[PDB]
Structure 1
Amino acid sequence: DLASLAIYSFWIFLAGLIYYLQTENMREGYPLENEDGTPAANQGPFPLPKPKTFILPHGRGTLTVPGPESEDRPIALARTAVSEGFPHAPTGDPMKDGVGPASWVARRDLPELDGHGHNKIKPMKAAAGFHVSAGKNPIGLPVRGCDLEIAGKVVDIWVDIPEQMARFLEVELKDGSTRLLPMQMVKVQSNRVHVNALSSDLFAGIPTIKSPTEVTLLEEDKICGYVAGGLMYAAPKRKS
């Protein structure tokens, strides 16, 4: 019977498809590892797929995956137990060390580029002629932390040019320098910008950028990680 053949065939196709899908999804983070960074004995029944190569635009190179995985950074953590499967305690200050919910990946220390090869993200003052088109303009507002203390003041919005959206608020601290706060981590209110993740005294600790009119993939990760990390690590000063 033809319908029997079709259904039997479809199930074979589907098993092959799942196989293809599962192996495609192993192009990052494999091979599996023990807690010490060495190859685990049990890799499971799916083998790594043949490598593929992405040609990156603007002479940024290629990416080939799967390939040799390494963190390319020290991880300030240590075992809390004598066997596998337990948590690893921060050895220093997890906010400063960039671990746990404060983690960052070692992405390329260059800015994301748009389709024309220009910096994707720019402060608004340097983006012609971008401006606030709706909603409360946060520029000028005091920035309050989860301790209800003023940490600083908004001096600009960093915008995504090709996608015409707000990505960071640039915030000036008591000392005259600035930090970026991810847009997703702030509440813009009528009289303030409220930051639930950080108490005021942790604002100085926000990773700084090296050029004041661009931000690198690497710097983005450190900022976003640091600010997210505050949810867990600032919790003693909140109390909300």
Structure 2
Amino acid sequence: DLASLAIYSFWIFLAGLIYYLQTENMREGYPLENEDGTPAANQGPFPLPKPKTFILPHGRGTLTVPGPESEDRPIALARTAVSEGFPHAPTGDPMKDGVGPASWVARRDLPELDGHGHNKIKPMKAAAGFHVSAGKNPIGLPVRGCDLEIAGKVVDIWVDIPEQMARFLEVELKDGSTRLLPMQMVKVQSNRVHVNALSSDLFAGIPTIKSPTEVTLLEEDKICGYVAGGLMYAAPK
């Protein structure tokens, strides 16, 4: 029967489709490793995908995946048990070491570029015509931590020009320096900006950026990682 041949054929096609999808989804992180970093014996029934290349715009080079996988950065963690399956505890300051919920990835120390080769993210004071068009404007507002103490004041807004959206709030600290705060980790209010992830004294520990007009992917990851990590490492305060 045709209907019978059809459905039978579809299930064959589907098994082949799933096989393809799973291997496509192994272009990052595989092969699997033992907790000591060495390759793991069991890699599953699905084989490693064959290399594919991405030619990045603006002479940024080419990415090949799968490929030599390495965390080009030290990991301040230690095994908690002999066997596998147990937590690895931070050897130092998780927040400062960038581990656990405060982890960051060694991305390119370059700014994400827009389609025309310009910095994607930029402080409003450097983006002609950008302004708050709705909602409360956090600029000039005090930034308060989970300790209820004021850590500083909002001196600017870093916007994703292409998407026209607020991504970072630049906060000036007592020492007079500034730090970027992810927009999705703050709560803008009528009189202040509340940050539940950090305590006022921890804002200084937020990794700093080199240029005052741009931010690299590497820095964005350190900033975001550090801030999100406060939810677990700055909660006691």
TM-score of the superposed pair, with normalisation by structure 2: 0.99
The superposition leaves residues 149-192 of structure 1 with CA deviations (integer Å, 9 ceiling, x where unpaired) of: 00000000000011100000000000000000000000000000
Q: In the TM superposition, what is the alpha-carbon distance from 1:235 to its structure 2 partner?
A: 1.2
Post-superposition, which runs of at least 4 consecutive aligned residues in structure 1 deviate over 4 A? none
The superposition leaves residues 97-147 of structure 1 with CA deviations (integer Å, 9 ceiling, x where unpaired) of: 000000000000000000000000000000011111101010000000000
**SS of equivalent residue, structure 2 residue 139:** coil
Q: In the TM superposition, what is the alpha-carbon distance from 1:83 to its structure 2 partner?
A: 1.1
The 1-side partners of 2:7 and 2:199 are apart by: 60
**SS of equivalent residue, structure 2 residue 55:** strand
The superposition leaves residues 68-122 of structure 1 with CA deviations (integer Å, 9 ceiling, x where unpaired) of: 1000000000011121110011000000000000000000000000000000000
Q: In the TM superposition, what is the alpha-carbon distance from 1:2 to its structure 2 partner?
A: 0.2
Q: In the TM superposition, what is the alpha-carbon distance from 1:50 to its structure 2 partner?
A: 1.1
Aligned length: 237
**SS of equivalent residue, structure 1 residue 83:** coil
Q: In the TM superposition, what is the alpha-carbon distance from 1:206 to its structure 2 partner?
A: 0.3
Unaligned segments of structure 1, at least 5 residues: none
CA-based RMSD: 0.7
The superposition leaves residues 168-219 of structure 1 with CA deviations (integer Å, 9 ceiling, x where unpaired) of: 0000000000000000000000000000000011011000001110000000
**SS of equivalent residue, structure 2 residue 155:** strand
Q: In the TM superposition, what is the alpha-carbon distance from 1:234 to its structure 2 partner?
A: 0.5
The 2-side partners of 1:34 and 1:73 are apart by: 18
Unaligned segments of structure 2, at least 5 residues: none
The 2-side partners of 1:82 and 1:4 are apart by: 54
The 2-side partners of 1:88 and 1:20 are apart by: 33
- Percent sequence identity over aligned pairs: 100
TM-score of the superposed pair, with normalisation by structure 1: 0.98
The 1-side partners of 2:147 and 2:104 are apart by: 25
